[PDB]
Coordinates of C-alpha atoms and ligand atoms in Angstrom, one line a residue:
Chain A
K2 CA 0.0 0.0 0.0
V3 CA 3.1 2.3 0.0
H4 CA 3.3 4.4 -3.2
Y5 CA 6.1 6.7 -4.4
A6 CA 5.9 9.0 -7.4
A7 CA 8.3 10.7 -9.8
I8 CA 7.7 13.6 -12.2
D9 CA 10.2 13.7 -15.1
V10 CA 10.1 17.1 -16.8
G11 CA 12.1 16.4 -20.0
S12 CA 12.4 18.2 -23.2
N13 CA 9.6 16.4 -25.2
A14 CA 7.1 14.7 -22.9
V15 CA 6.6 15.3 -19.2
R16 CA 6.0 12.2 -17.2
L17 CA 4.4 11.1 -14.0
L18 CA 5.4 7.6 -12.6
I19 CA 3.9 5.9 -9.6
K20 CA 5.2 2.7 -8.2
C21 CA 4.1 0.5 -5.2
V22 CA 6.3 -1.2 -2.7
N23 CA 5.8 -5.0 -3.2
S24 CA 5.9 -7.8 -0.7
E25 CA 9.3 -9.1 0.5
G26 CA 9.3 -12.4 -1.3
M27 CA 8.8 -10.7 -4.7
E28 CA 11.8 -10.0 -7.0
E29 CA 11.7 -6.3 -7.8
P30 CA 11.0 -4.3 -4.6
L31 CA 8.9 -1.9 -6.7
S32 CA 6.2 -2.2 -9.3
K33 CA 4.8 0.4 -11.7
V34 CA 1.1 1.2 -11.1
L35 CA 0.5 4.3 -13.2
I36 CA 2.4 6.1 -16.0
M37 CA 1.4 9.4 -17.7
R38 CA 3.2 11.0 -20.6
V39 CA 2.1 14.5 -21.8
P40 CA 4.1 16.1 -24.7
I41 CA 4.6 19.7 -23.6
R42 CA 7.9 19.8 -25.6
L43 CA 9.5 22.5 -23.5
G44 CA 12.7 22.1 -25.6
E45 CA 11.0 23.5 -28.7
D46 CA 10.8 26.8 -26.8
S47 CA 14.1 26.4 -24.9
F48 CA 16.4 25.4 -27.7
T49 CA 15.0 28.0 -30.2
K50 CA 13.9 30.9 -28.0
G51 CA 16.3 30.5 -25.1
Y52 CA 13.4 30.5 -22.6
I53 CA 10.0 28.8 -21.8
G54 CA 7.2 30.8 -23.5
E55 CA 4.0 31.7 -21.6
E56 CA 1.8 29.1 -23.3
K57 CA 4.0 26.2 -22.2
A58 CA 4.6 27.7 -18.8
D59 CA 0.9 27.9 -18.2
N60 CA 0.3 24.3 -19.6
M61 CA 3.1 23.2 -17.2
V62 CA 1.0 24.6 -14.3
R63 CA -2.1 22.9 -15.5
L64 CA -0.1 19.6 -15.9
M65 CA 1.4 19.9 -12.5
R66 CA -2.1 20.3 -11.0
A67 CA -3.3 17.2 -12.8
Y68 CA -0.3 15.2 -11.6
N69 CA -0.8 16.5 -8.1
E70 CA -4.4 15.2 -8.1
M71 CA -3.1 11.8 -9.3
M72 CA -0.5 11.8 -6.5
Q73 CA -3.3 12.6 -4.1
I74 CA -5.4 9.8 -5.4
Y75 CA -2.6 7.3 -4.7
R76 CA -1.8 8.9 -1.3
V77 CA 1.8 8.8 -2.3
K78 CA 4.3 8.7 0.6
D79 CA 6.9 10.9 -1.1
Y80 CA 7.8 12.2 -4.5
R81 CA 10.5 14.1 -6.4
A82 CA 10.1 16.2 -9.6
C83 CA 13.2 16.7 -11.8
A84 CA 13.7 18.8 -14.9
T85 CA 16.5 18.3 -17.3
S86 CA 17.9 19.8 -20.6
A87 CA 15.0 22.1 -21.6
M88 CA 14.8 23.7 -18.2
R89 CA 18.6 23.8 -17.7
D90 CA 18.9 25.8 -21.0
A91 CA 15.9 28.1 -20.4
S92 CA 16.8 31.6 -19.2
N93 CA 13.5 31.9 -17.3
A94 CA 13.8 28.5 -15.7
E95 CA 13.7 29.7 -12.0
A96 CA 10.7 32.0 -12.7
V97 CA 8.8 29.1 -14.4
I98 CA 9.5 26.8 -11.5
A99 CA 8.5 29.3 -8.9
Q100 CA 5.2 30.0 -10.6
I101 CA 4.6 26.2 -10.5
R102 CA 5.1 26.0 -6.7
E103 CA 3.0 29.0 -6.1
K104 CA 0.1 27.8 -8.2
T105 CA 0.3 24.0 -7.5
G106 CA 2.6 23.1 -4.6
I107 CA 4.8 21.0 -6.8
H108 CA 8.5 21.7 -6.3
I109 CA 10.7 20.9 -9.4
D110 CA 14.5 20.5 -9.0
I111 CA 16.7 21.4 -12.0
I112 CA 19.4 18.8 -12.1
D113 CA 22.6 18.9 -14.2
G114 CA 23.8 16.4 -16.8
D115 CA 25.9 14.5 -14.3
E116 CA 23.1 14.0 -11.8
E117 CA 20.8 13.1 -14.7
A118 CA 23.2 10.4 -16.0
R119 CA 23.2 8.7 -12.5
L120 CA 19.5 9.1 -11.8
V121 CA 18.8 5.5 -13.0
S122 CA 17.4 2.2 -11.6
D123 CA 20.7 0.8 -10.5
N124 CA 18.7 -2.3 -9.3
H125 CA 17.7 -3.1 -12.9
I126 CA 21.1 -2.3 -14.4
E127 CA 22.9 -4.4 -11.7
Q128 CA 21.0 -7.5 -12.7
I129 CA 21.4 -6.9 -16.5
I130 CA 25.2 -6.4 -16.3
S131 CA 26.0 -9.1 -13.7
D132 CA 27.7 -11.3 -16.3
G133 CA 30.7 -8.9 -16.1
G134 CA 30.4 -8.0 -19.8
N135 CA 30.7 -4.5 -21.4
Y136 CA 27.5 -2.5 -21.5
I137 CA 26.6 1.1 -22.6
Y138 CA 23.5 2.4 -20.9
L139 CA 22.2 5.0 -23.3
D140 CA 19.3 7.4 -22.4
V141 CA 18.3 9.4 -25.5
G142 CA 16.1 12.4 -24.6
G143 CA 14.8 15.4 -26.3
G144 CA 17.7 17.7 -25.5
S145 CA 20.6 15.5 -24.3
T146 CA 21.9 11.9 -24.4
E147 CA 23.5 10.2 -21.3
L148 CA 26.0 7.5 -21.9
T149 CA 27.2 5.2 -19.0
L150 CA 29.8 2.5 -19.6
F151 CA 29.7 -0.7 -17.5
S152 CA 32.4 -3.3 -17.4
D153 CA 32.8 -6.2 -14.9
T154 CA 29.7 -5.1 -12.9
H155 CA 31.4 -1.7 -12.3
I156 CA 30.8 1.8 -13.6
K157 CA 33.6 3.1 -15.9
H158 CA 32.5 6.3 -17.6
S159 CA 29.4 8.5 -17.3
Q160 CA 28.7 11.6 -19.4
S161 CA 25.9 13.7 -20.7
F162 CA 25.9 15.1 -24.3
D163 CA 23.8 17.9 -25.6
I164 CA 22.4 15.8 -28.5
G165 CA 18.7 15.1 -28.3
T166 CA 15.7 14.5 -30.6
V167 CA 14.1 17.9 -30.3
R168 CA 17.4 19.8 -30.3
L169 CA 18.3 17.9 -33.5
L170 CA 14.9 18.6 -35.1
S171 CA 15.3 22.3 -34.3
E172 CA 18.7 22.1 -35.9
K173 CA 20.3 23.6 -32.7
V174 CA 23.0 21.1 -31.9
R175 CA 26.1 23.2 -31.5
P176 CA 29.5 23.1 -33.2
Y177 CA 31.8 20.3 -32.0
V178 CA 29.1 18.6 -29.9
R179 CA 28.6 15.7 -32.4
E180 CA 32.3 15.4 -32.9
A181 CA 33.1 15.2 -29.2
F182 CA 30.3 12.5 -28.8
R183 CA 31.8 10.5 -31.7
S184 CA 35.3 10.8 -30.2
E185 CA 34.1 9.5 -26.9
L186 CA 32.5 6.5 -28.5
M187 CA 35.6 5.6 -30.5
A188 CA 37.8 5.9 -27.3
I189 CA 35.3 3.4 -25.8
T190 CA 35.5 1.0 -28.8
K191 CA 39.3 1.1 -28.8
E192 CA 39.3 -0.2 -25.2
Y193 CA 36.0 -2.2 -24.8
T194 CA 34.9 -5.1 -27.0
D195 CA 31.6 -7.0 -27.3
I196 CA 29.5 -4.1 -26.1
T197 CA 25.8 -4.5 -25.5
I198 CA 23.6 -1.4 -25.5
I199 CA 21.0 -0.9 -22.8
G200 CA 18.7 1.5 -24.4
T201 CA 16.2 3.7 -22.6
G202 CA 13.8 6.4 -23.6
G203 CA 10.3 6.7 -25.0
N204 CA 11.6 6.5 -28.5
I205 CA 13.6 3.2 -28.1
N206 CA 10.5 1.5 -26.5
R207 CA 8.4 2.4 -29.5
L208 CA 11.2 1.4 -31.9
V209 CA 11.6 -2.0 -30.2
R210 CA 7.9 -2.6 -30.8
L211 CA 7.9 -1.4 -34.4
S212 CA 10.9 -3.8 -35.1
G213 CA 9.0 -6.8 -33.8
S214 CA 11.0 -7.2 -30.6
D215 CA 8.3 -6.5 -28.0
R216 CA 8.9 -7.9 -24.5
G217 CA 5.7 -10.0 -24.2
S218 CA 6.1 -12.8 -21.7
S219 CA 9.9 -12.3 -21.6
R220 CA 11.8 -10.6 -18.8
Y221 CA 13.5 -8.2 -21.2
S222 CA 12.8 -6.9 -24.7
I223 CA 15.9 -7.5 -26.8
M224 CA 16.3 -5.9 -30.2
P225 CA 19.1 -6.7 -32.7
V226 CA 20.7 -3.6 -34.1
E227 CA 19.9 -5.0 -37.6
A228 CA 16.3 -5.0 -36.6
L229 CA 16.5 -1.4 -35.6
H230 CA 18.3 -0.6 -38.9
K231 CA 15.5 -2.2 -41.0
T232 CA 12.9 -0.4 -39.0
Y233 CA 14.8 2.9 -39.5
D234 CA 14.8 2.4 -43.3
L235 CA 11.0 1.8 -43.2
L236 CA 10.4 5.0 -41.3
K237 CA 12.9 7.5 -42.7
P238 CA 11.6 8.1 -46.3
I239 CA 7.9 8.8 -45.5
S240 CA 6.7 12.1 -44.1
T241 CA 5.8 12.4 -40.4
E242 CA 2.0 12.5 -40.7
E243 CA 2.2 9.4 -42.9
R244 CA 4.4 7.8 -40.2
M245 CA 1.7 8.7 -37.7
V246 CA -1.2 7.1 -39.5
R247 CA 0.6 4.1 -41.1
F248 CA 2.4 3.1 -37.9
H249 CA 0.1 4.3 -35.1
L250 CA 2.5 6.9 -33.7
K251 CA 1.4 9.9 -31.7
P252 CA 2.2 13.2 -33.4
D253 CA 4.8 14.0 -30.7
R254 CA 6.5 10.7 -31.3
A255 CA 6.4 10.4 -35.1
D256 CA 8.9 13.2 -35.8
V257 CA 11.4 12.6 -32.9
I258 CA 11.6 8.8 -33.5
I259 CA 13.9 9.5 -36.5
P260 CA 16.7 11.3 -34.8
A261 CA 16.3 8.9 -31.8
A262 CA 16.9 6.0 -34.1
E263 CA 19.8 7.8 -35.7
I264 CA 21.5 8.4 -32.3
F265 CA 21.2 4.7 -31.4
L266 CA 22.4 3.6 -34.8
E267 CA 25.5 5.9 -34.6
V268 CA 26.3 4.5 -31.1
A269 CA 25.8 0.9 -32.4
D270 CA 27.9 1.5 -35.6
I271 CA 30.9 3.0 -33.8
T272 CA 31.0 0.4 -31.0
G273 CA 30.0 -2.5 -33.2
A274 CA 27.3 -3.4 -30.7
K275 CA 24.9 -6.0 -32.2
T276 CA 22.2 -6.0 -29.5
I277 CA 20.0 -3.4 -27.7
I278 CA 18.4 -4.4 -24.4
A279 CA 15.4 -2.2 -23.6
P280 CA 14.5 -2.7 -20.0
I281 CA 11.7 -0.1 -20.1
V282 CA 13.1 1.9 -17.2
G283 CA 14.3 5.5 -17.2
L284 CA 14.9 8.6 -15.2
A285 CA 11.5 8.4 -13.4
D286 CA 12.4 4.9 -12.2
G287 CA 15.7 6.2 -10.8
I288 CA 13.9 8.9 -8.8
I289 CA 11.7 6.3 -7.3
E290 CA 14.6 4.0 -6.4
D291 CA 16.2 6.9 -4.6
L292 CA 13.0 7.6 -2.7
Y293 CA 12.6 3.9 -1.8
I294 CA 16.2 3.8 -0.5
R295 CA 15.7 7.0 1.6
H296 CA 12.7 5.6 3.5
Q297 CA 14.2 2.1 3.6
Chain B
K1 CA -5.0 21.9 -34.5
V2 CA -8.5 20.7 -33.6
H3 CA -8.7 18.3 -30.7
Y4 CA -11.6 16.2 -29.3
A5 CA -11.7 14.5 -25.9
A6 CA -13.6 11.5 -24.5
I7 CA -13.8 10.6 -20.8
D8 CA -14.8 6.9 -20.3
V9 CA -15.9 6.3 -16.8
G10 CA -15.7 2.5 -16.7
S11 CA -15.9 -0.1 -14.0
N12 CA -12.2 -0.8 -13.7
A13 CA -10.1 2.0 -15.2
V14 CA -11.4 5.6 -15.9
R15 CA -9.9 6.9 -19.2
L16 CA -9.2 10.1 -21.0
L17 CA -8.6 10.0 -24.7
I18 CA -7.7 13.0 -26.8
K19 CA -7.5 12.9 -30.6
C20 CA -6.6 15.5 -33.2
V21 CA -8.2 16.1 -36.6
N22 CA -5.8 15.1 -39.3
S23 CA -6.1 16.0 -43.0
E24 CA -7.5 8.3 -40.8
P25 CA -9.3 11.5 -40.1
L26 CA -8.4 11.3 -36.3
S27 CA -5.2 10.5 -34.5
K28 CA -4.6 9.6 -30.9
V29 CA -2.5 12.2 -29.1
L30 CA -3.1 11.5 -25.5
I31 CA -4.4 8.5 -23.4
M32 CA -4.7 8.4 -19.7
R33 CA -5.8 5.4 -17.7
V34 CA -6.5 5.5 -13.9
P35 CA -7.9 2.5 -12.0
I36 CA -10.7 3.9 -9.8
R37 CA -12.4 0.5 -10.0
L38 CA -15.9 1.8 -9.3
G39 CA -17.4 -1.6 -9.8
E40 CA -15.7 -2.9 -6.7
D41 CA -18.0 -0.7 -4.7
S42 CA -21.0 -0.8 -7.0
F43 CA -21.4 -4.5 -7.6
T44 CA -20.8 -5.3 -3.9
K45 CA -22.2 -2.4 -1.9
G46 CA -24.7 -1.2 -4.5
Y47 CA -23.4 2.5 -4.4
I48 CA -20.2 4.4 -4.9
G49 CA -18.2 4.8 -1.6
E50 CA -16.9 8.1 -0.4
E51 CA -13.3 7.3 -1.1
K52 CA -13.9 6.4 -4.7
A53 CA -16.2 9.4 -5.2
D54 CA -13.6 11.7 -3.7
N55 CA -11.0 10.2 -6.1
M56 CA -13.4 10.7 -9.0
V57 CA -13.6 14.4 -8.2
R58 CA -9.8 14.5 -8.1
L59 CA -9.6 12.6 -11.4
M60 CA -12.1 14.8 -13.3
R61 CA -10.2 17.8 -12.1
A62 CA -7.0 16.4 -13.6
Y63 CA -8.7 15.4 -16.9
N64 CA -10.2 18.9 -17.1
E65 CA -6.8 20.4 -16.8
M66 CA -5.6 18.0 -19.5
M67 CA -8.5 19.1 -21.8
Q68 CA -7.6 22.7 -21.1
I69 CA -4.0 22.0 -22.1
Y70 CA -5.2 20.8 -25.5
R71 CA -7.9 23.5 -26.0
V72 CA -10.3 20.8 -27.0
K73 CA -13.2 21.8 -29.2
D74 CA -15.6 19.5 -27.5
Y75 CA -15.7 16.5 -25.2
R76 CA -18.1 13.9 -23.9
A77 CA -17.8 11.9 -20.7
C78 CA -19.8 8.7 -20.5
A79 CA -20.3 6.3 -17.6
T80 CA -21.3 2.7 -17.9
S81 CA -22.0 -0.4 -15.9
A82 CA -20.6 0.6 -12.5
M83 CA -22.5 3.9 -12.5
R84 CA -25.7 2.4 -13.9
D85 CA -25.7 0.0 -11.0
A86 CA -24.8 2.5 -8.2
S87 CA -27.8 3.9 -6.2
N88 CA -26.0 7.3 -5.6
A89 CA -24.7 7.6 -9.2
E90 CA -26.7 10.8 -10.0
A91 CA -25.7 12.5 -6.7
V92 CA -22.0 11.7 -7.3
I93 CA -22.3 13.0 -10.9
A94 CA -24.1 16.2 -9.8
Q95 CA -21.3 16.8 -7.2
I96 CA -18.6 16.1 -9.8
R97 CA -20.2 18.6 -12.2
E98 CA -20.4 21.2 -9.5
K99 CA -16.9 20.8 -8.2
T100 CA -15.0 20.2 -11.5
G101 CA -17.2 21.4 -14.4
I102 CA -17.2 17.9 -16.0
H103 CA -20.6 16.6 -16.9
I104 CA -20.9 12.8 -17.0
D105 CA -23.7 11.0 -19.0
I106 CA -24.8 7.7 -17.8
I107 CA -25.5 5.6 -20.9
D108 CA -27.4 2.3 -21.1
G109 CA -26.0 -0.9 -22.5
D110 CA -27.6 -0.5 -25.9
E111 CA -25.9 2.9 -26.3
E112 CA -22.7 1.5 -24.9
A113 CA -22.8 -1.3 -27.5
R114 CA -23.0 1.1 -30.4
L115 CA -20.6 3.7 -29.0
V116 CA -17.7 2.5 -31.2
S117 CA -15.3 3.7 -34.0
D118 CA -17.5 2.6 -36.9
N119 CA -14.7 3.9 -39.2
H120 CA -12.3 1.3 -37.9
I121 CA -14.9 -1.5 -37.8
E122 CA -16.1 -0.8 -41.3
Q123 CA -12.6 -1.4 -42.6
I124 CA -12.0 -4.7 -40.7
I125 CA -15.4 -6.2 -41.9
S126 CA -15.4 -4.9 -45.5
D127 CA -14.7 -8.3 -47.0
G128 CA -18.2 -9.3 -45.9
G129 CA -17.1 -12.0 -43.5
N130 CA -18.7 -12.9 -40.2
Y131 CA -17.3 -11.0 -37.2
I132 CA -18.2 -10.6 -33.5
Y133 CA -17.0 -7.3 -32.1
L134 CA -16.5 -7.9 -28.4
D135 CA -16.0 -5.3 -25.7
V136 CA -15.1 -6.9 -22.4
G137 CA -15.4 -4.4 -19.5
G138 CA -15.3 -4.6 -15.7
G139 CA -19.1 -4.7 -15.4
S140 CA -20.6 -5.6 -18.8
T141 CA -19.6 -7.2 -22.1
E142 CA -21.0 -6.0 -25.4
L143 CA -21.4 -8.3 -28.4
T144 CA -22.1 -7.1 -32.0
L145 CA -22.5 -9.6 -34.8
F146 CA -21.4 -8.4 -38.3
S147 CA -22.2 -10.2 -41.5
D148 CA -22.1 -9.0 -45.1
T149 CA -20.9 -5.6 -43.7
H150 CA -24.2 -5.3 -41.8
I151 CA -25.0 -5.3 -38.1
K152 CA -27.1 -8.5 -37.4
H153 CA -27.2 -8.4 -33.6
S154 CA -26.1 -6.1 -30.8
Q155 CA -26.5 -6.9 -27.1
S156 CA -24.9 -6.0 -23.7
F157 CA -24.6 -8.5 -20.9
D158 CA -23.9 -7.8 -17.2
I159 CA -20.7 -10.0 -17.3
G160 CA -17.4 -8.2 -16.7
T161 CA -14.0 -8.7 -15.1
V162 CA -14.7 -6.9 -11.8
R163 CA -18.2 -8.3 -11.5
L164 CA -16.6 -11.8 -11.9
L165 CA -13.9 -11.2 -9.3
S166 CA -16.6 -10.1 -6.9
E167 CA -18.6 -13.3 -7.7
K168 CA -21.6 -11.1 -8.5
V169 CA -22.4 -12.2 -12.1
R170 CA -26.0 -13.4 -12.0
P171 CA -26.3 -17.0 -13.4
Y172 CA -29.2 -16.1 -15.7
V173 CA -26.9 -13.6 -17.5
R174 CA -24.2 -16.3 -18.1
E175 CA -26.9 -18.5 -19.5
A176 CA -28.2 -15.7 -21.8
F177 CA -24.6 -15.0 -23.0
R178 CA -24.1 -18.7 -23.9
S179 CA -27.5 -19.1 -25.5
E180 CA -26.9 -16.1 -27.8
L181 CA -23.4 -17.3 -28.7
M182 CA -24.9 -20.7 -29.6
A183 CA -27.6 -19.2 -31.7
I184 CA -25.0 -17.1 -33.6
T185 CA -22.8 -20.2 -34.2
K186 CA -25.8 -22.2 -35.5
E187 CA -26.4 -19.6 -38.1
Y188 CA -22.9 -18.1 -39.0
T189 CA -19.7 -19.9 -39.9
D190 CA -16.1 -18.8 -40.1
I191 CA -16.4 -16.2 -37.4
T192 CA -13.5 -13.8 -36.6
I193 CA -13.6 -12.0 -33.2
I194 CA -12.8 -8.3 -33.1
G195 CA -11.7 -7.9 -29.4
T196 CA -11.4 -4.6 -27.5
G197 CA -10.7 -3.6 -23.9
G198 CA -7.6 -2.8 -21.9
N199 CA -7.3 -6.5 -21.1
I200 CA -7.2 -7.8 -24.7
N201 CA -4.5 -5.4 -25.8
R202 CA -2.3 -6.7 -23.0
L203 CA -3.1 -10.3 -23.7
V204 CA -2.1 -9.8 -27.3
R205 CA 1.3 -8.6 -26.3
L206 CA 1.9 -11.4 -23.8
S207 CA 0.9 -13.8 -26.6
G208 CA 3.6 -12.5 -29.0
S209 CA 1.0 -10.9 -31.3
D210 CA 1.8 -7.2 -30.9
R211 CA 1.2 -5.4 -34.2
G212 CA 4.3 -3.2 -34.2
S213 CA 4.7 -2.4 -37.9
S214 CA 1.6 -4.3 -39.0
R215 CA -1.8 -2.6 -39.4
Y216 CA -3.6 -4.8 -36.8
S217 CA -2.6 -7.1 -34.0
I218 CA -3.9 -10.6 -34.8
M219 CA -3.8 -13.2 -32.1
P220 CA -4.7 -16.9 -32.8
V221 CA -7.0 -18.2 -30.2
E222 CA -4.5 -21.0 -29.5
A223 CA -2.0 -18.4 -28.4
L224 CA -4.5 -16.8 -26.0
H225 CA -5.1 -20.2 -24.6
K226 CA -1.4 -20.8 -23.9
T227 CA -1.0 -17.3 -22.5
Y228 CA -4.0 -18.1 -20.2
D229 CA -2.4 -21.3 -19.1
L230 CA 0.8 -19.4 -18.4
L231 CA -1.0 -16.7 -16.3
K232 CA -3.7 -18.7 -14.4
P233 CA -1.8 -20.8 -11.8
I234 CA 0.5 -18.0 -10.7
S235 CA -0.6 -15.7 -7.9
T236 CA -1.8 -12.2 -8.7
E237 CA 1.2 -10.5 -7.2
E238 CA 3.7 -12.9 -9.0
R239 CA 2.1 -12.2 -12.4
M240 CA 2.5 -8.5 -11.7
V241 CA 6.2 -8.8 -11.2
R242 CA 7.0 -11.6 -13.6
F243 CA 4.9 -10.4 -16.6
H244 CA 5.1 -6.6 -15.8
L245 CA 1.3 -6.1 -15.3
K246 CA 0.0 -3.2 -13.3
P247 CA -1.9 -4.3 -10.2
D248 CA -5.3 -3.3 -11.5
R249 CA -4.6 -5.3 -14.6
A250 CA -3.0 -8.5 -13.0
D251 CA -6.3 -9.7 -11.4
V252 CA -8.9 -8.8 -14.1
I253 CA -6.8 -10.2 -16.9
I254 CA -7.9 -13.8 -15.9
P255 CA -11.7 -13.4 -16.2
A256 CA -11.2 -11.3 -19.3
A257 CA -9.3 -14.2 -21.0
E258 CA -12.0 -16.6 -19.8
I259 CA -14.7 -14.5 -21.4
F260 CA -12.8 -14.3 -24.7
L261 CA -12.0 -18.1 -24.7
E262 CA -15.6 -18.9 -24.0
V263 CA -16.7 -16.9 -27.0
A264 CA -14.0 -18.6 -29.2
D265 CA -14.8 -22.1 -27.8
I266 CA -18.5 -21.7 -28.6
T267 CA -18.2 -20.0 -31.9
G268 CA -15.1 -21.9 -33.1
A269 CA -13.4 -18.6 -34.0
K270 CA -9.8 -19.1 -34.7
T271 CA -8.5 -15.5 -34.6
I272 CA -8.9 -12.4 -32.5
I273 CA -8.3 -9.0 -34.2
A274 CA -7.4 -6.4 -31.7
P275 CA -7.6 -2.9 -33.4
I276 CA -6.8 -1.0 -30.1
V277 CA -9.9 1.1 -30.2
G278 CA -12.7 1.3 -27.7
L279 CA -15.7 3.2 -26.3
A280 CA -13.6 6.4 -26.0
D281 CA -12.8 6.3 -29.7
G282 CA -16.6 6.0 -30.4
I283 CA -17.3 9.1 -28.4
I284 CA -14.7 11.0 -30.4
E285 CA -16.0 9.7 -33.7
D286 CA -19.5 11.0 -32.6
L287 CA -18.0 14.4 -31.7
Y288 CA -16.2 14.7 -35.0
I289 CA -19.4 13.8 -36.9
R290 CA -21.3 16.5 -35.0
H291 CA -18.8 19.2 -35.9
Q292 CA -18.2 18.3 -39.6
Ligands
LIG312 MG1 14.9 12.8 -20.0
LIG313 MG1 18.3 14.4 -21.2
LIG314 MG1 19.9 6.7 -7.3
LIG315 MG1 -16.1 0.1 -20.7
LIG316 MG1 -19.2 -2.2 -20.0
LIG317 MG1 -10.6 -6.3 -23.2
LIG318 MG1 -21.1 6.7 -33.1

């Protein structure tokens, strides 16, 4: 009956996640009970205007009220709300957040890239990487991409890069950012072989399903990089509203799925990774793991 | 640029669906699903309890905020089996309207049966084959028989997942469901089931029949039967963890499978098409028709 909630204020959708604490004998201590995903796309303002415009600020207030009602319905014990790239990069970020407290009671923390990269479900990663192999946990968002290297059950390198789906669509990725990202991947490939990608983000979960790799009754959904590539070639050459209708994609997903696939494919090409494991956890899950640990 | 919303006040989850007008005429942009499980109160106590009614007010506030975010042109909120059966339904709805601005219509089972996306059904049945469109809810199940592209029968039965878990399904209703299914089978061959509900969409994925890049998810009944045998013996909580089911889904998925398997066993249907549309899509179709 204990519930925790996380609010993930990213650069495309803004999410609410609620999880329950399970019984002791169960495997995972925590199970998802409710997930909401609302496409405010703050990054569309942030990365092109430099600030959050009034329409999205007001919609964020409305959304935070809605998520507050939902947290009240589940009588959640504790929560945290984090915002990432699009709020980091907005000049009026503090004003927008203060309006949201005043009007809704919800307190949003702005977290930097480093905190973002480590705000993960270590419990899920620990179990995936326990064979001691080499893994790259890759979170592709709307404004940034976090890469964490795992080898021999131990964390080796963790970095945030300002390449994301909405920033790419807006054509606002800045000089030398792609190059630095490529250079980091090559230094990883020179030193780590047989890399498996652990892919997270709303885009990779939809890609895994479009490519025929849905989890189903399995513990993990596992997508070959070749399956992703074939799916990419299917999606790239048609327009976005045709992608919507033909493949049952929400409008806020049908455009960003392309640069998302391109990021994963670049990472896979450089590292020679053949497999993407998609555990369907993300930043919200990492918030709830922290909350669970805090309260024991 | 134009958005319509539907609020579907069911007996297990309470849903918000928002679609945009394209230039399919309508695309899904937002879906929210919150498990109030009104039927747990209604089919047992015969009214909505105060906790669930308070949560309904909270929920309609949240969905109203969502509808404001999308500047929706029009909406409709419909309530079905659990509200029909609750003695204080109109009081709860009047208070919801006063406190939130959301007006909920209580619809009867005939209206519920026909409150569907006829645009999607029309495409699935255009070859003129025999189809049963089946909506399995928490409180009632709607059956519509299609043949030669025409509607041949439409009926609602007070059999649902939450009503079954509560052991409140009247035996006479089970007999009527079976008799109608037998009369259909006597008269129509080569039946395909068109299945809808939150439960069927999940059972489709567990059975390895997710659509992904296909137009429709198509599950052989044999695969549903194996998925049922995988899920049944396990405890509700283990299913939750092992098969990644939300708690409000991990119990009702069993009687939902059983309803679908009974339909398939009696009619001999080999296939279930799951087009991932439901009552909420039917509301939005109606709103779109009204404003065209
Ligand atoms: Mg993010
Ligand atoms: Mg990010
Ligand atoms: Mg942590
Ligand atoms: Mg229903
Ligand atoms: Mg019903
Ligand atoms: Mg169903
Ligand atoms: Mg209609």
